[PDB]
Scaffold this active site. Structure first.
Site, PDB file in Angstrom:
ATOM      1  N   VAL B  99       0.780  50.532  52.235  1.00 13.02           N
ATOM      2  CA  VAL B  99      -0.047  49.492  51.628  1.00 13.02           C
ATOM      3  C   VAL B  99      -0.116  49.763  50.121  1.00 13.02           C
ATOM      4  CG1 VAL B  99      -2.350  48.388  51.582  1.00 13.02           C
ATOM      5  CG2 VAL B  99      -1.414  49.323  53.753  1.00 13.02           C
ATOM      6  N   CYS B 100       0.126  48.726  49.310  1.00 15.32           N
ATOM      7  CA  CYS B 100      -0.092  48.782  47.859  1.00 15.32           C
ATOM      8  C   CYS B 100       0.673  49.975  47.282  1.00 15.32           C
ATOM      9  CB  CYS B 100      -1.603  48.776  47.674  1.00 15.32           C
ATOM     10  SG  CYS B 100      -2.156  48.465  46.006  1.00 15.32           S
ATOM     11  N   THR B 101       0.055  50.813  46.453  1.00 18.24           N
ATOM     12  CA  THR B 101       0.766  51.906  45.818  1.00 18.24           C
ATOM     13  C   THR B 101       1.135  53.027  46.781  1.00 18.24           C
ATOM     14  OG1 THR B 101      -1.361  52.724  45.070  1.00 18.24           O
ATOM     15  CG2 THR B 101      -0.036  51.437  43.492  1.00 18.24           C
ATOM     16  N   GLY B 102       0.791  52.921  48.061  1.00 17.99           N
ATOM     17  CA  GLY B 102       1.313  53.876  49.018  1.00 17.99           C
ATOM     18  C   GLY B 102       2.830  53.928  49.061  1.00 17.99           C
ATOM     19  N   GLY B 148       3.888  46.648  52.104  1.00 20.12           N
ATOM     20  CA  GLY B 148       3.105  45.446  51.895  1.00 20.12           C
ATOM     21  C   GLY B 148       2.221  45.534  50.671  1.00 20.12           C
TER      22      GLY B 148
END
Ligand SMILES: [Cl-]
Ligand SMILES: [Cl-]
Lengths: 226, 226
Positions: B99-102, B148
């Site tokens: 998710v996002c900056t993961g 995502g």
């Protein structure tokens, strides 16, 4: 600093709370509280462990109070200490809000009498005995009361509260910083759009809980009638 | 039982994790883990305190691994213990997700080399140095990798994973039980739809973080080049 408080109770549906918490905690000059009878660990219905940050007695006067839902709502509807706290804070709060079955707690506290409100679709029949005018809409406002449906209701209404506490540009900035633009891969989030077979399954799985909550609601209504 | 694991690290963006956690924990025959170096309290970027349930060494082989984002991603991109754990689990997992900056953590671990992927809009330029093919789409799949965008990306892709691990009717039932049907009150969740003035503000506020992450990314890329 704007003071925002969430009630955190055993068997809460944690996303009802953690969604709006992360959005509102992104705003400048806010302080967010997680309130229970004492600070310390509170277990959500999934087993996720959260920490309450303040007790009822130590909580400051709130500008926004938010009641999440979850399995644990049944006990809270007959918890006189919690109901008294909610009534005290609601008297001076700028916004009284709830997510999903959290509105049944507002109902048990007497705060829905004569007010338009919604709740989770499977429990919607419990609003009228608590004095509410039931409305089948995702977000229902009546004065300073805002009740919303869906596990992520508080993410959306948090953006509304950001715009009204600050300004529209601030709400838009938070939305962009979080890149918040949902797009569910299915369209079964309402009993009016889900397949009939799915609605049946979901209703059958909620039946025992609804039965127990019918009993609790009648006792709560009797207390309001006194 | 399907084994699902989330990496839980200091300064995580908690909603990136807590959203998919509540959805996936609603499924039958799943076990969800919150993984860090040892069990115990981990503080999210908002100050919310969460509890890790298992250590790296004790975590079972996972069917799904999910890496959330947040401020804390910078440290994790140079944490050799965390990166080695992610690589070990990704080798046999059915789904590797972020998710996002993961996704920048997946990149630092070497798992985006030659793969299509996305990340948060303000940090998207960091994907190419980590070997990825950058894609500006909200959910990007490449084989068993799913990256995502948006703080609630994992809620949506959790429904996709439910449908593929179980069946569509199961995913639809979970969506209905959660009454999940978002409707944001603003349309500023992408730099392509937000007002230009809002995009500027958001870019200015991310500038120091982007600068620091450019430096970290180059060191991470050097390790991959060896
Ligand atoms: Cl929703
Ligand atoms: Cl999103």
């Amino acid at each position: 600093a704007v003071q925002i408080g969430f009630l955190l109770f055993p068997e809460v549906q944690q996303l009802d709370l953690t969604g709006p918490h992360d959005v509102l905690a992104s705003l400048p000059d806010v302080q967010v509280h997680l309130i229970w009878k004492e600070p310390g660990p509170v277990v959500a219905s999934s087993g996720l462990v959260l920490q309450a940050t303040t007790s009822f007695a130590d909580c400051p006067p709130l500008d926004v109070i938010c009641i999440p839902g979850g399995t644990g709502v049944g006990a809270l509807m007959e918890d006189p200490q919690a109901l008294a706290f909610i009534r005290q804070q609601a008297a001076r709060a700028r916004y009284v809000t709830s997510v999903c079955t959290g509105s049944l707690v507002l109902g048990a506290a007497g705060l829905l009498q004569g007010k338009r409100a919604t709740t989770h679709w499977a429990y919607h029949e419990l609003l009228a005995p608590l004095g509410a005018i039931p409305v089948h809409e995702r977000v229902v406002r009546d004065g300073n009361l805002l009740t919303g449906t869906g596990i992520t209701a508080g993410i959306d209404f948090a953006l509304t509260l950001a715009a009204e506490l600050f300004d529209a540009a601030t709400a838009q900035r938070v939305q962009l910083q979080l890149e918040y633009a949902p797009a569910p891969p299915f369209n079964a989030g309402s009993p009016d759009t889900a397949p009939a077979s799915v609605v049946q399954q979901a209703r059958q799985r909620a039946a025992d809980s609804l039965h127990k909550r019918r009993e609790i609601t009648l006792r709560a209504a009797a207390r309001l009638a006194a």
